[PDB]
Design a binder for these strands. Structure first.
Ligand SMILES: [Mg+2]
Ligand SMILES: [Mg+2]
Ligand SMILES: [Mg+2]
Ligand SMILES: [Zn+2]
Lengths: 132, 337, 62
RNA sequence: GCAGCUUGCUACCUCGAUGUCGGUUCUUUCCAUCCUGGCCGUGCAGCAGCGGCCAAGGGUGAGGUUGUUCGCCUAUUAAAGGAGAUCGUGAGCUGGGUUUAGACCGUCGUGAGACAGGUCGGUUACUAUCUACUAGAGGUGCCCGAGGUCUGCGGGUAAGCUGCUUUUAGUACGAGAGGAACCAAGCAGCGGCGCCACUGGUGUACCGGUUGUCUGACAAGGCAUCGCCGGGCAGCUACGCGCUCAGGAAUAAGAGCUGAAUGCAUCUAAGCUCGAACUCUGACCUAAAAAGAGACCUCUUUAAGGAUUCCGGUAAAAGACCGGUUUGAUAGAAACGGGAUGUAAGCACCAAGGCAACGAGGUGUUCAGUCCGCGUUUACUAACCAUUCGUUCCUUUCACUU
RNA sequence: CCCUAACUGGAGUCCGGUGAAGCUUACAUUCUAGUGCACAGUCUAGAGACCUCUAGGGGGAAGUGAAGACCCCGUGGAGC
RNA sequence: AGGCUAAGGCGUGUCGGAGUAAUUCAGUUAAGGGAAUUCGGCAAAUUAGCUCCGUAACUUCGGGAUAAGGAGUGCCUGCU
């Protein structure tokens, strides 16, 4: 997609369970694969901030559970750097449930969200209240 | 067998990976001239790295205009003396040295490298090279330069490093007359490179000794149960049954580092004249403080501190004129904290 | 070039250095070095550490 | 008909053993091409297909079952091709299956026992002689003697390959829906090379807290994985960071121009112009041990200069390499700068209390104390004293010196 | 494991002392193809190759260990 | 038990110097992810003493049971 302004390490890889922080009803979602990521041999599919991911709901409502959805990771403990040289990090990982193009399924996002995903997916920026 | 495909480990583009045959990098090719006469190369010594907060000026970049922190590399680049003027005769076999003329006046420190040439055939060698250029035997003129590291306190040496730097002009008579003007003089790095222009940095990289295949080629460590069976940092197989020989393309241990490498499009960010503008508190680590005139190069450069760095104008520079940078802050805080 | 102050030691964040640590509730802390971030992560308080300027402030209160 | 990549047929080689499947690691090869590049046809409007030709430079992944090969299934993806290399690869690994000795189930057999049936368990030996490769040196060969700077016979490369988004453009096309390409820009995936300002790891230098115990108590220390725990400079390193283009020539399929054989027409029979991720040049690494064994300049012949002794680190497995040597800041000390930890011991007061003695601990002296495999100033000490080669070695086979 | 990194002690590397063993008809600096009992460093035709030493891990020597324990044969055995 | 010390026995679990690679035997630590590795959580990691609260299916009524899930713990002053 559109290039962000900050370098983001691909912290999360396939099999990680990330606290889904929207009101979609899915609580914990496991990363199955990552859109727009061709791998190399033996390398697990990694996903840093602003990446769309294919996830399966592990914990949540009875209707969201076991589905395969599209999610965007909005926070990560693995620190990234801003263009001015400062490194930014978060207390926990988190992803929101979205569509192919970037529109979230939920209506409010609890907690902060990195500003890079706000500038890439502007609907994710507007839906979330506090942006970091 | 359902083959799983992996790219080859390491590059065969840089083989045989042996120890480079000189501490001075050598340029195999030089860019064609596009303007007024000037030396195409300068030599400096790498001091260390810092970072600047420069306003972004790169056209079409995402972060244009806004503040960025660019890792720079301060390089201590005093004046150089254009020692000799050497002309080459081109033929079917190749370029061959046809004649040289050394400068009459030269630094006394040069004796540690080569015995000092006498101030003899200065006018007559020049007229001989002029006649050779006139008749047509001469094709290109190059200048011999050496550093004068006796001033630098961070570099322990005082012997010059001698190297050839081609002149950049249009006509071989024009090149000869410019070389006559600059022969035997001290030309600062401001007379070669301009502020904001790309260059090519070549230098013998950091020697890492006899390193193993996992570090030399980035091969895979043995995984899982194979990690503790007796071969962990060893290549899994050296060849098939046939052909009955180890290929040269198999990863193996050997000399890692201390190779010559060329880096393209290393931008110049600052042309300074006082070492206190960039020298941090406590000096640089294992170097000292800057005492001559320097240049700030964006990004990394091959080689450790104190290594000779050869600078030439770019040979494959994609981008146009870039303009003067706008440094807001050269970070001269301590590198030891 | 916004001027940033370290949450723990009180040192001013120099340009091109430091970290920005964010909690789950949107609170942001500027850490000048790994030492300040590690002391924050242990649960220590700047007021109860004498080398920080907050600890010096509290000790010079009395 | 081809291939010999499945199963057969055969019995030519091997039974004084060519370690037998599958996976893993790493390298290479073929094209009958899955994707990437170039074309042709269409029942090709566009988008997207379908079929064919050229093309092997690069890519061809991650997972669930199963020992599997194969095959299915999942979500990505440009695509997630196939095959060869003793069904590549056990003096590399694994040991899941098959193919030992034990045992159970079923079926055969009167029985011992058997099953191209299933199940559980079941030893991976070796100090590398030669060769090959990978790097590092010592010689001679070439050669006025030495040094320096270059050239380039050659060798190598993928040094890049490929997607996503924006613009072109909601335009061409189309009745509508739907919907491209040329140029340009940014970012990303993988690969390559390099680096340590920033971030992260380590950091058994160092600093602090503290358990148990020993040295009589305090102080200072020993041991218990660095006792454990917290922090971390330098260094190294990635999880961090820098760079990573073409252009040109000749071409394959193909598309044409001129043009006859065949008065015309014809891309072909001569000739000519374009035409690809291929080839070549261009970059980049290496390259006088190129037997055509190189070119030029400088210095000087008992010298030029090299090596060793000495102080070192930009280097280092040994060698080698790169510097300094009193006309010197090469390494060390002293001091200071810059940093690591967190406020030392002793003393004064306070301390929940205790009649008292005592008292964990708090505050002041004290941003203290301790420490720095970093820098600067500084010859204070140590880089001094030598030494050997550049003489065949004796000879008066002499260019001599008793 | 993605994906490896740094550090510690013992080896290894280098040095002083001591000090064996296993493979071995000979030669041997190889590489390609063919031929040959159809799996060649020694044949045939080409291509490369100056020699010596050190370190490296194991491509090849159908590497060494060993009169195959699988299959067959023996007017050979043993146990049941 | 394990750790630290007496007495007692020893520096002979009879090769030393040196601190310069790769690799190897045995250890320490490792961001973010947490079995995605693999035939298989093999190996390693986690937890761990004592007191108190509390403890399920099922059961041959004996058990399961230390089930599981939790809290406290040092030092000093003074006492019962
Ligand atoms: Mg083998
Ligand atoms: Mg036999
Ligand atoms: Mg018979
Ligand atoms: Zn701070």
């Amino acid at each position: 997609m559109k290039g962000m302004r900050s370098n983001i390490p691909r912290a999360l890889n396939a099999g990680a369970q990330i606290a889904c922080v929207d009101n979609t009803g899915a609580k914990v979602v496991e990363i199955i694969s990552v859109k727009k990521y061709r791998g190399v041999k033996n390398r697990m599919p990694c996903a840093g901030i602003g990446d769309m991911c294919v996830v399966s709901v592990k914990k949540g409502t009875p209707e969201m559970r076991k589905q395969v959805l599209l999610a965007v990771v909005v926070r990560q403990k693995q620190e990234f750097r801003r263009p001015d040289g400062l490194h930014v990090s978060f207390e926990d990982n988190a992803m929101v449930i979205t569509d192919e193009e970037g529109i979230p399924k939920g209506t409010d996002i609890k907690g902060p969200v990195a500003r890079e995903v706000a500038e890439r997916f502007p609907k994710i920026g507007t839906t979330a209240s506090i942006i970091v | 067998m359902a083959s799983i495909h992996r790219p080859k480990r390491g590059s065969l583009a840089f083989s045989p990976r042996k120890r480079a045959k000189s501490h001075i990098p050598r340029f195999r090719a030089w860019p064609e001239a596009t303007g007024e006469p000037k030396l195409q190369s300068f030599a400096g010594y790498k001091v260390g790295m810092t970072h600047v907060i420069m306003v972004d000026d790169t056209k079409n970049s995402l972060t244009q205009g806004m503040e960025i922190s660019v890792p720079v590399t301060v390089i201590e680049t005093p004046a150089i003396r254009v020692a000799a003027i050497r002309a080459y005769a081109e033929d079917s076999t190749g370029e061959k040295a046809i004649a040289e003329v050394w400068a009459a006046d030269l630094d006394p420190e040069l004796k540690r490298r080569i015995p000092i040439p006498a101030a003899g055939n200065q006018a007559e060698a020049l007229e001989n090279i002029g006649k050779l250029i006139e008749e047509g035997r001469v094709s290109d003129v190059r200048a011999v330069i050496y550093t004068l590291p006796k001033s630098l306190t961070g570099v322990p040496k005082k012997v010059p490093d001698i190297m050839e730097s081609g002149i950049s002009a249009r006509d071989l008579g024009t090149k000869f007359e410019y070389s006559k003007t600059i022969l035997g003089t001290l030309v600062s790095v401001t007379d070669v490179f301009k502020n904001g222009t790309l260059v090519d940095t070549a230098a013998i990289t950091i020697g890492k000794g006899t390193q193993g295949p996992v570090k030399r080629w980035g091969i895979q460590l043995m995984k899982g149960k194979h990690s503790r069976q007796g071969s962990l940092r060893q290549v899994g197989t050296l060849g098939a049954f046939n052909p009955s020989r180890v290929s040269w393309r198999v990863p193996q241990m050997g000399q890692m580092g201390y190779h010559q490498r060329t880096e393209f499009n290393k931008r110049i960010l600052k042309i300074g004249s006082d070492g206190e503008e960039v020298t941090p508190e406590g000096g640089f680590i294992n170097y000292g403080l800057v005492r001559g005139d320097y240049i700030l190069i964006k990004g990394s450069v091959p080689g450790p501190s104190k290594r000779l760095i050869r600078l030439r104008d770019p040979i494959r520079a994609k981008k146009a004129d870039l303009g003067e940078p706008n440094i807001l802050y050269i970070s001269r805080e301590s590198k030891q904290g | 070039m916004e001027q940033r102050k370290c949450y723990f030691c009180g040192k001013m964040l120099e340009p091109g250095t430091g970290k920005l640590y964010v909690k789950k509730d949107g609170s942001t802390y500027f850490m000048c070095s790994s030492k300040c971030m590690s002391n924050f992560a242990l649960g220590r308080l700047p007021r109860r550490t004498e080398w920080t300027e907050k600890g010096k402030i509290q000790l010079k209160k009395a």
